[PDB]
Write a protein that binds this ligand. Structure first.
Ligand SMILES: CCCCCCCCCCCCCCCCCCCC(=O)O[C@H](COC(=O)CCCCCCCCCCCCCC)COP(=O)(O)OCCN
Ligand SMILES: CCCCCCCCCCCCCCCCCCCC(=O)O[C@H](COC(=O)CCCCCCCCCCCCCC)COP(=O)(O)OCCN
Ligand SMILES: O=S(=O)(O)c1cc(N=C=S)ccc1/C=C/c1ccc(N=C=S)cc1S(=O)(=O)O
Ligand SMILES: CC(=O)N[C@@H]1[C@@H](O)[C@H](O)[C@@H](CO)O[C@H]1O
Ligand SMILES: CC(=O)N[C@@H]1[C@@H](O)[C@H](O)[C@@H](CO)O[C@H]1O
Lengths: 542, 539
């Protein structure tokens, strides 16, 4: 057993040894919750270390749950491929439809002309636009929307000679992305996650903990209206985004290190702006006027986004409330657009048969907006298992009883002083959300915090708001949040790079949430520090 | 001009014009039954005419049902990706694992070696091996695997001068021997597909529909019982098909047909040529531990399939009795084990017995994810799920009862003539379109009609479900036919003439073995069972 043996063969050692070492967890304790804990622990070690492919590791619960007796085999498979998963896959398909024509190149060339063709400036603009867009739309939709634009921008910069997308070349193993590509893709993913926290309709986590608070505490003086939540949350969101942008510049592009070879590259790229402006303008003119194919794709995309926005906005009715015979969710418009792409034609030259006294006749079947061959090749189909694993694991945790075990576990924190309690609550929320779905963590932690707040005589919002915002802060692993998985799949990003890079945003968001809550929340809700009367009534009743 | 536009642009006309033309059905009638019927009619016309891609057409229910009153968005999406579909996808992945590392080549060449080398014995060996392989793999995959071997043998035979691939002199016309070999391979693929549930998708479709419609039925189509029902008839008509082709092209029973002389030249000489080329082409190397491990995993998976719920003893799924397991943990277990296990075990030189060069990098596994992602057909998810979802919506909306009441008049006809008519109609419909589409269209209608009359549902569903897989006349009928017609430049007229034999043989064989052997496998097909009475009364 030389050291070289470990250097070469450590993945197999992990796969062989970890289950045997983790066996005592279930052997010592009787309940089924400990079986679920064992399975979760082994899956977590496989995710962090990446001994197996991620997609294969996500296939374990199908085998594991029926054997352990947690839940039946038919139910487990149905837990995959739920409504939200269909929405995600449809979004990826629509993005490929956009890429099939050259609309993404047109949009990229337009943006470069406005920005000024500087690598540092473009990155800032794309992050800000992504955050503003994600304030009103689901995060995965924004990430899928924005990925091809980033790809086109990187190709243009490479064409001008500024940078390289991939390192110069186990022939199967895909190319390793460069520092700048990592910076851009991680930037758009993090920007989606950070900008989501802005408004009440930005993401489902906000709606979840809002609903829990409203249900548990009616007759509450303080209220989470649409304007008030935004007024509370926006400044912190701005500070997150700017500080995260600065950190990303420092980590990957050598912002404050002039000697570093990273900075010299950006300096040489910026040196050539004057001629690059004419080059970009000429290359844009080289593209012809927008064809009908592009216009049709663009109209379909705008229609999809508008239908996304107007469903139960909360400030007016929307189309969901008109149709109340059955529940309708966001999967409907997406698949509608996917089908409509296959129905419509790319050209209308066949109309020359009946009009314009004839003309050049196609002499062939007319292509549609997209082809199935392009979809079957480009879509990453492993994401089905990776995303469905989260739903399956969450439902298994709920069925087994491990969630109640965790909720009982948090109760012991009552002894701590107030500020230390707030900090520990934020840390616990971040750690738990690292490995699981955001909504599940909110569901398990929030009611405990409400009850514990009533017990110890402090205002419930004081703990509820920071934790609810904290559940969204997931940056380390691809399995933490759908944007991470999407960007990892689109451009092959190894887990180690993401885990190392994610350190900055975590510290930044924790510190800034702590400070702005403790100070600015007092301004927005003046009675936060003190204990109100209606809280006393509920405490006495309970 | 006028005809040419229709010739080029008929698919767009269908797609545009069918929904508007079928709209009055929904407009004039008030019930939800008619909305479901309108959706069914449009989807059926799209599947038959191929106006829109099959996988894309299958996605319509997700949009259509929630907008109407049928079902919610969550429920419709759950209808996709059931247990059986996961079993089928895992089986495809395991078959890919077998294809990787070239085990099928070993089995095929070894069996051909064991059987004779003369042209007739070579034909017999090719047909039998193709049938056996197609029992567990997709049909087109088996055809693609098997064609190169006969191509090489034919090339060498032509080079020697013992036989000619083509007529002497707009592609060249293949001769009778080439037609015999290639058509035999395609037909063998199609016939052997029917033997097993995982052999072809149509089996999964009709089994899943039957299980969904009648959850209380006491007769079950589990993996072993289906095999018991299907295998003997498969062997009988495979043998009869082989005998038919030999008479049609090689003059088997005609002593001097001017076709037996070619075979006599083949048996006199070039037997050694074929033997040498096949023996040399079997130079894969010694059997390796990688292949052995894959083989053991496959055998273990099948053994787990048989011992789920046997009548003789308990077995698993009874020792683990808290929840249902249902033939889905073995398949995914094998798939994961393929990624866990190494392929060399040469790294054990490090510990002791250092007899050779040690590895300098990570050791590969039995398979890679890149191979899986590029080879698996992922549209089957949408196609199969769409079939299941349409069936379930038909059940819930209430349109199923309306169709059954309409077909009550067929009660006067005797049971045997009804079975024959069902088989004939299934074959005729299959002639022009996809097998899975036809199964989706016709199986639920048969189930409801069976409830209306006093007939056991299996009695009609099994023969029709198997008949949906019998397609030989045209390239459009099934992908193996198209692949074979592409390889050897087969004109349509010859294929249509040659396919007459298998049609009659399979029809007669199904007609006889159903009525006789099914009663041995299912003793209660002649009677009307109690649970059927309960279902009919409730409906
Ligand atoms: C009530 C119902 C209960 C049901 C229970 C079901 C349990 C199922 C789950 C089982 C979990 C464990 C599975 C382990 C599989 C074998 C893993 C072997 C890994 C291996 O050999 O790695 C090498 C080093 O091994 C070493 O150094 C390890 C020592 C040698 C191990 C030899 C293993 C093979 C021989 C035995 C096979 C059977 C094992 C038991 C099933 C280096 O490999 P690498 O990293 O270079 O390349 C890896 C390419 N993937
Ligand atoms: C309670 C009420 C419920 C109502 C329910 C209604 C349900 C409606 C369902 C959808 C119906 C509309 C379908 C829209 C797409 C039509 C696609 C036509 C394709 C086309 O032009 O085909 C060409 C010939 O067209 C022709 O010769 C025909 C004329 C084509 C005109 C094109 C018009 C485009 C805009 C249509 C808007 C429709 C809005 C909805 C009415 C030849 O094509 P090919 O074979 O060469 O290529 C094939 C690949 N494409
Ligand atoms: O988590 S739960 O399975 O309990 C769940 C129940 C619901 N009940 C109802 S209606 C609705 C949603 C829901 C889970 C949603 C997600 C679960 C995991 C995600 N990412 C990962 S990994 C993202 C979402 S998201 O769609 O909310 O963004
Ligand atoms: C119990 C109820 O419905 N409403 C009470 C209200 O009567 C009381 O004056 C107030 C004190 O802040 O707390 C709340
Ligand atoms: C709940 C239910 O469907 N029960 C029926 C039962 O009434 C019937 O006697 C039996 C036939 O063997 O099939 C089952």
């Amino acid at each position: 057993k030389c050291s070289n043996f470990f250097a070469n063969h450590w993945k197999g050692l992990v796969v062989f040894l970890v289950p045997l070492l983790c066996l005592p967890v279930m052997l010592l304790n009787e309940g089924a919750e400990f079986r679920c804990m064992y399975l979760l622990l082994v899956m977590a070690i496989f995710w962090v270390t990446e001994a197996l492919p991620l997609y294969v590791t996500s296939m374990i619960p199908i085998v594991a749950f029926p054997i352990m007796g947690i839940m039946s085999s038919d139910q487990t498979c149905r837990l995959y491929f739920k409504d939200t998963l269909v929405m995600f896959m449809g979004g990826i398909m629509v993005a490929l439809a956009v890429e099939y024509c050259n609309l993404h190149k047109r949009l990229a060339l337009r943006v470069i002309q406005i920005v000024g063709c500087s690598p540092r400036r473009l990155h800032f603009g794309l992050i800000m636009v992504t955050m503003f867009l994600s304030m009103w739309i689901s995060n995965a939709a924004c990430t899928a929307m924005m990925c091809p634009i980033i790809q086109a921008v990187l190709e243009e910069l490479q064409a001008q000679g500024v940078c390289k997308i991939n390192h110069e070349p186990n022939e199967d193993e895909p190319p390793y992305p460069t520092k700048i590509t990592l910076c851009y893709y991680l930037g758009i993913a993090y920007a989606s996650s950070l900008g989501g926290c802005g408004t009440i309709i930005g993401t489902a986590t906000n709606l979840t903990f809002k609903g829990i608070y409203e249900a548990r505490f009616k007759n509450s003086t303080e209220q989470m209206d649409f304007p008030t939540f935004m007024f509370y949350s926006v400044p912190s969101m701005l500070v997150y985004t700017l500080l995260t942008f600065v950190f990303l510049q420092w980590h990957f592009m050598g912002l404050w290190r002039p000697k570093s070879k990273e900075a010299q590259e950006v300096q040489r790229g910026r040196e050539g702006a004057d001629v690059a402006k004419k080059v970009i303008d000429q290359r844009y003119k080289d593209l012809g006027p927008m064809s009908i194919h592009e216009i049709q794709v663009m109209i379909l995309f705008i229609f999809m986004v508008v239908m996304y926005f107007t469903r139960k906005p909360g400030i007016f009715l929307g189309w969901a409330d008109l149709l109340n015979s059955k529940d309708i969710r966001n999967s409907m418009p997406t698949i509608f657009v996917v089908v409509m792409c296959f129905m419509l034609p790319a050209n209308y030259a066949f109309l020359r048969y009946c009009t314009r006294r004839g003309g050049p006749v196609p002499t062939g079947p007319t292509p549609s907006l997209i082809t199935w061959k392009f979809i079957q090749t480009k879509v990453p189909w492993g994401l089905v298992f990776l995303l469905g694993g989260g739903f399956a694991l969450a439902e298994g945790s709920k069925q087994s009883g491990m969630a109640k075990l965790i909720g009982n576990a948090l109760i012991g924190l009552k002894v701590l002083p107030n500020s230390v309690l707030l900090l520990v609550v934020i840390l616990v929320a971040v750690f738990l959300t690292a490995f699981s779905s955001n909504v599940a963590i909110a569901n398990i932690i929030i009611p405990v915090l409400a009850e514990m707040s009533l017990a110890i005589e402090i205002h419930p919002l004081y703990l509820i708001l920071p934790a609810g915002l904290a559940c969204s802060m997931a940056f380390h692993l691809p399995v933490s949040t759908p944007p991470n998985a999407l960007v990892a799949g689109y451009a092959n990003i190894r887990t180690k790079d993401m885990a190392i890079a994610g350190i900055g945003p975590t510290i930044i968001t924790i510190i800034t949430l702590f400070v702005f809550c403790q100070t600015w929340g007092l301004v927005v809700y003046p009675n936060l520090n003190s204990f109100p009367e209606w809280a006393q009534i509920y405490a006495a009743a309970a």
